[PDB]
Structure formats: structure tokens, C-alpha cells
Design a protein around this ligand. Sequence first.
Ligand SMILES: Nc1ncnc2c1ncn2[C@@H]1O[C@H](COP(=O)(O)OP(=O)(O)OP(=O)(O)O)[C@@H](O)[C@H]1O
Ligand SMILES: Nc1ncnc2c1ncn2[C@@H]1O[C@H](COP(=O)(O)OP(=O)(O)OP(=O)(O)O)[C@@H](O)[C@H]1O
Ligand SMILES: [Zn+2]
Ligand SMILES: [Zn+2]
Lengths: 184, 96, 48, 362, 145
Amino acid sequence: VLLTNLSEHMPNDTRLQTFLELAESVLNYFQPFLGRIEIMGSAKRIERVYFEISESSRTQWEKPQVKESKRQFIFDVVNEGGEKEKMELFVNFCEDTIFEMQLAAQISESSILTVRSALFALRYNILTLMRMLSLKSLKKQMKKVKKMTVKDMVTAFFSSYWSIFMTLLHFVASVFRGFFRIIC
Amino acid sequence: ELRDQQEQVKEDMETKCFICGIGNDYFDTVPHGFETHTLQEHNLANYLFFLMYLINKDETEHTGQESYVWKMYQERCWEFFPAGDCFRKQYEDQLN
Amino acid sequence: ELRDQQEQVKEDMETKCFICGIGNDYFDTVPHGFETHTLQEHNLANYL
Amino acid sequence: FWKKIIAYQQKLLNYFARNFYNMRMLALFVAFAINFILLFYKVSTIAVHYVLEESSGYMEPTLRILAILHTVISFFCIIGYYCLKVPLVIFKREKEVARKLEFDGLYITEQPSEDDIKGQWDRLVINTQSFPNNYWDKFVKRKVMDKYGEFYGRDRISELLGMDKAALDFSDAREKKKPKKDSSLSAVLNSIDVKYQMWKLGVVFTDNSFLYLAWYMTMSVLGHYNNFFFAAHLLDIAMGFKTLRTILSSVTHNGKQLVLTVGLLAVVVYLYTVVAFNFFRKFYNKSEDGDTPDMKCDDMLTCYMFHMYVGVRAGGGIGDEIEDPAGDEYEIYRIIFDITFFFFVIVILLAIIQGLIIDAFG
Amino acid sequence: TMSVLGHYNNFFFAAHLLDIAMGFKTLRTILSSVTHNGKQLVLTVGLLAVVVYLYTVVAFNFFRKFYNKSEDGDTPDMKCDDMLTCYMFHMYVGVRAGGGIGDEIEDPAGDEYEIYRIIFDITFFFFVIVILLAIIQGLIIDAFG
Ligand SMILES: Nc1ncnc2c1ncn2[C@@H]1O[C@H](COP(=O)(O)OP(=O)(O)OP(=O)(O)O)[C@@H](O)[C@H]1O
Ligand SMILES: Nc1ncnc2c1ncn2[C@@H]1O[C@H](COP(=O)(O)OP(=O)(O)OP(=O)(O)O)[C@@H](O)[C@H]1O
Ligand SMILES: [Zn+2]
Ligand SMILES: [Zn+2]
């Protein structure tokens, strides 16, 4: 807190930034617990105040119910709120929320199968597609296609994509079968 | 009407600060200045945490600033909330 | 249209003074300045 | 030999990629032509006959020619998609996985959620030698290495990324230099990275647009067995024309709210069914001849079916279809029942649906 | 030309009442609601015609038995034995009907296809009668706004 105060009130002191580089790790550790607000001080100046924020308070603040209450509060203030009562309503909301987070902290004291089936279907069907190349038996085809003409060339070009589309159809059927087995 | 109200809430929160009420452009003269101001300098969650800490702190252990804010919260005066001013605006010359 | 007209009336009265016509921000450079101006300095009831 | 076959393959791929969109227009035009020819179809004699009756007589061969052409164009549209838009999908996927690997450690520090099929399937491509095949950055493996090589161990990072350790130093040292021509079948077989092609095929199969095109081709094929299967291709206008997108976006903008409104209507109708079944079972006779009574609300499921179908489709409510209550001890209660049904179901809920559509437009 | 033809047939003078849209600027504001989104209004009708054609395909393939429209049993008048006739029926009677095609075709009670036909009728009513007409009305209202 002392170092943050000094840094923010002396923004261009090279000796101070080198010292902060020395103090880097501690500041990183204490960043979540360090609070920072600005108030209209007694000396008719805006004064910045540093305090401590507790981990329990932060967690209870980040609980989803408190977030929903915050959204409702902001909606109400923006839509049907005046400028006089804005800070009064904000303080009332803060008090109610503080009470509810304290009570929550008090009380709080001490799918996959379908994804797996789809992945297995992908692996199996793609493997069955790739066995055709993995046999390394393309020699028999190469015997006849040594006399490679444009017609046979285009025929093989189409046949590859036709095989891919057959594999996709088989994969979709396998997915449906697995999903039915899972739901049953 | 409900959709327009939601849009109005979004626009207000994205264009002006909740506490001081200054527009986004003034802070945006410095890059990311508006979000820096609304998330570190004038965060409403920080004010809530400060009220929590000040209530849960012993009155005898209060500092001068804490005692000022405590007395004034007890008397329900909200002048201590910065309205129309901020650290940057006060120290424009020195900070920049 | 009726709802939009009501909203326009509200926005105009909340953003600029009835008499002089200056915006709210200029008065709001001083806290509560706009309502001070529109309720003590330039109040239309006071002119009436 | 290979220098010619690869060149001609590339020419064909380029042609299909260039003409992908024109073929997608031609498929729609042929689909409209086939469906217009099918509109002059009649059944004859039960005996169901696939007989096209027309005065000209030539539309019958024209239908077969058009069906064959449609199937060919549908196949060509899959080929063109593969040549044109698959590379962009692979590029984006490889970019995303690389960024998650480097700036998030998606497989070094953290692990996939075991419920993300994309994340689980992407584990295959990390070990591949042909990684960023499409993505420009070829130093992602050396970047992850430099980022996490000390904390998580160089030998473990290298194993995760498929980086081979000793080969680099053993080649930088005294190393034999003799290349071997790829013209051999063994060489061209060894060149292919099986695992990377596996992962790429999986990504393509999981792609939505490729699945839609496969469905298109499947329906085109089934159209030969039954010609009326070609009518499903008229559902492609929503994607073919950008003008229909604006109209359909009104419906799709608030689809969740539209479904919830129907669910709420089904609940309100169920409550009305409960009330009618408990108190007004006498007015639900739907038989004109008195000898056989046909009661529609003696059963809960039948009464709910009646209310959901006839009562909802009726313009005045369930009172338009059930018996008149005049001169009965429950006349007032039944009148309230009918009026409330008409007001809440017929008037308000349908107004909610229409308001949702109008608000989507606005 | 229409004024001249009015002498041969006096009822040709009724076409000149179509001139009010241009004569009065007040009607321009009302008509601009329709003309502002005319392309969308035509496309909506085209989409309705396609959806009705799909429903006609389904009815022709599976529900040809419920489309008898003759009261006397001696002469059956089937409206869906022909594709064009069935489409005409669906486009005219079914669309103009307030409850859908189920208001005009035979009751499906006690049939093996009862559930499928009920789904058919409900979906027709929801998509055609309720949604598409709502799209047209929303287009007009949005043009006003
Ligand atoms: N004093 C303020 N404190 C916090 N946010 C402010 C303040 N003034 C304005 N804002 C605006 O509020 C935005 C944050 O929105 P908000 O706090 O309502 O939550 P959110 O972004 O909707 O989501 P979440 O619930 O996850 O925090 C900031 O980006 C900023 O533009
Ligand atoms: N010259 C002005 N005189 C008074 N109010 C003004 C003037 N210029 C602007 N205003 C605005 O009018 C607001 C007061 O609203 P208004 O006088 O219409 O009544 P109200 O708040 O709706 O209620 P009430 O009828 O109880 O007075 C002020 O808050 C201010 O923003
Ligand atoms: Zn602020
Ligand atoms: Zn004034």
C-alpha cells in the first residue's frame, strides 16, 4: 500500500520505478486484496484511499446471484432514478448486498458419453477410410493405370471424393446409432 | 419499451462513469483511459468493499480519512462521493 | 409516437435549462450545479 | 509422369474452386425446374403409380435428364467446396489451436474440458510433423518450446509437440547428404502424414457447411428412387438468396422466445384442460347422432389433444366447438371459462408472437 | 385512353378512381407503408408459396385419403389426386381458412396416421396462418416506423 501510494502520487520518479521493479513480486501478490477509491477529502481536494479487500468478500461479490442483483440495481437506478437519490440508493444497495454476502459466507462453512461416442465414431470411420491407402497395395491399380489417360485420371479424381462422402455417411449413421444406444 | 430501456441502461453505463458522471471521451484522451478509470479509480465494487471494510473495522483504529468518511456516513451525507471531479481532472497539470 | 414524444420532453428538460438553454454539463462542472441553476437561478416558477 | 498428373489435378481443383458458386446457383435452378415439372404429376389406379401425365409428353425424359444433371451438380458442389472453403476452415482451426497452445498452454498447463469435441480432437494435430500446413507461422513449436521449456521440461514439451530432439544436432554435425526422388510409389506413400490427414478429415466432417452439402447430395441421390425427394432442395432458397435472409431473421432473431411462448401456451392449455376435465366433461360430446356418443374429454390425454388442436385453431376459442351452456347450473362458470380462454390464448399469446416478430424487425 | 374506352363501356370509367393515390398527398403516407417494403412483401408471398408447395407434397404422398370434398357418397370429389389440383386447394382454401387446411379436410380421428396428420395441421396453422401473415403485418408496421 505504501509503495502504491508513492507510485501513484509521484508518477515520474525514475528512482521510484526502479525500486518498484525490485518490489514487483509482492505487489503482484497483493494486487487482488488492494482496494482503491477516490473521495472528496476534508481539504477540498480529491483524495485517493487504499484499504484491504478480503478474499471471502471478493468471492461473495463474484457469486452470480450478487451479479444479478447488481444488474437489477443498475437497471432501476438508470431508468427510474434521480440525481439526488442516486448515491442514497447506491448506499442502500451496498448495505443490503454487504449483509447478504456476510450471511452467505457465514452459511457456506465446511454430454461426455455422447462426445466420447462421436470421437470414437470419427476415429473408426476415418481409419476404415485410410486402410485403403495403408494396405500399400496400390501396385495392382498402378498396373492398369500405367497407361494413364485423362479419362481414368478424372475417374480416380472423382472416386476419391465419392469415397470420402461414403465415409461421412457411415460416420453419421454410426453417430446416430451410438446416440440411440446411449439414450436407451 | 423494455428493449429501449435495456439499450438506454447499456448506453449510459458505456458512456459515463457511475460515480463522477464524466463522459468517456475525456478519459479516452488517454488510451484505455475510460476503462482504467471505471475499473481501478472509480469502481463501484471498490466503494462497496470500502463500506464493508469501514463497517467491520474498529472505530478506534480508524485513520483520519476513515474517520471522516465514517462520521459523514453516520450523518448520511454523500458529499464525499466525487461528483464531477476526479484525480486526473484535479491534477491535470502535474499528472500530464 | 406518443411514448417517444414523452421521452423527448423528459430528455430535453433533463439536459438543458428551459430559460437560457445551456446544457447540463457546463453547470455540472460544479456538483449539483445544474439543479441549483434550474431551481434557484433560472426557475420558471420564479419568473411566473 | 507425376509432374503432369499433379498439374492436371491442380487445374481441375482450380476450375472447381473457381466455379463453386455458379454450380450452387445452377443446382437451385435445376431444383426449381424439376419441382415445376413434378407439379404436373398425378396418381392413377391401392395402386400407386409413378406416372407423369402431360400433353407434350417430352417432360418425362426431361425429368430424368434433369435429375441426373442435378445429382452431378450436387457432387460438383461438394468438390468445389472441398477445393475452395476447406482451406480457410483448416487455416482458422490451426490458428486457434496454435494461439491457445502458446498464449494459454491448452495442452501444457491446462487441459480440455473433456466435453469439448473440438478441443479433444485437436490433440491429434499437435504431434504432426506437417503442422501449420496452412497457417503462416511455422515457428509456433519453437515458441511454445521457448515459453514452457524450463518449467515443464524440454523433454516433455518436445514429446508433446512431436519435436524430434537428437536429429537436429546429429544433422548439424557430420551428416550424410543424399536425397531420394519422390517419383517412387514408396516415396509418395511415405510422404503423406497420415495423422495430419486424419485430423483434417475429422475437422471437415465436423464442419457444418460440408454436412449441409452432404445432406443436399444425399437427397439428390434419393430423388432418383422417389422423385418427390427433390422438393427438399427448395429449402435451399434461404441460403441461396440474401434477400430472404432479412425476412427470415425476423423469425430467427427471437426464436428462443418464440419457442418459450409455445411452451407457455401448452401449459395454459393444459391448465384449461384440467379444469374442463374436472368440471365440464358434459359439454364435450362431439357426436351428432345420439345413438353413439363421442366424448372428447372422458380421457385426460384426449381432452388435452382436443384443446391443443381444435380449441387453439378455432377463431373464437374452445367455446366455438363445445356445446352451448344455456340453461345449466354451470352456465356462468362455463362462460367465464370460454371468455378467459379466448382472451388469454387466442388474443394475447398470438399477439405476443406477432409482437416478437415486429420487435425483431425493429 | 381509358376515358375514351369509357364511351364504349361506361364501367371503364372506374379505372380513373385509381388516380386518387396521385391526386391526394394524404394517401401517399398510407400507401408508402405498403410500397416501402414491397420487395420484402413479394418475397414473403413467394416463400409462402414454397412452404405451401412443400405441404402439398407431403399431403399428396401421405394424406390423399382425407381430401374428399363431396358430401354425396355416390360421386367422390377428391382434391388431392392430382398434384396441381392439390396445390391449388392448399393455396386457395387452406390459406384463406382461419384455422388452416385442417378446417377444410376430413377429421383424422381413429386413423393410423392420426398423430402425423395432427402435427401436419398444427404446423400448417403455426407457420402459414400465424407467422407469415405476422411477417407481412410487421413489415407494414416497420415501414410506418
Ligand atoms: N463506476 C463504475 N464501476 C464499474 N463499471 C462502470 C462504472 N462506470 C461505468 N462503468 C461501466 O460498466 C462496465 C462494466 O459493466 P458491468 O459492471 O455492469 O458488468 P458487465 O460488463 O455487464 O459484466 P459482469 O457482470 O461480468 O461484470 C464498464 O466497462 C464501464 O463501461
Ligand atoms: N428553468 C427551469 N425551471 C425548472 N425546472 C427546469 C428548468 N430547466 C430545466 N428544468 C428541469 O425540470 C426538472 C423539474 O421537472 P418539473 O418542473 O417538470 O417537475 P417534476 O420533477 O416532473 O415534478 P413536480 O410536478 O412535482 O414539480 C428539474 O429537475 C430540471 O432538470
Ligand atoms: Zn468516475
Ligand atoms: Zn438557465
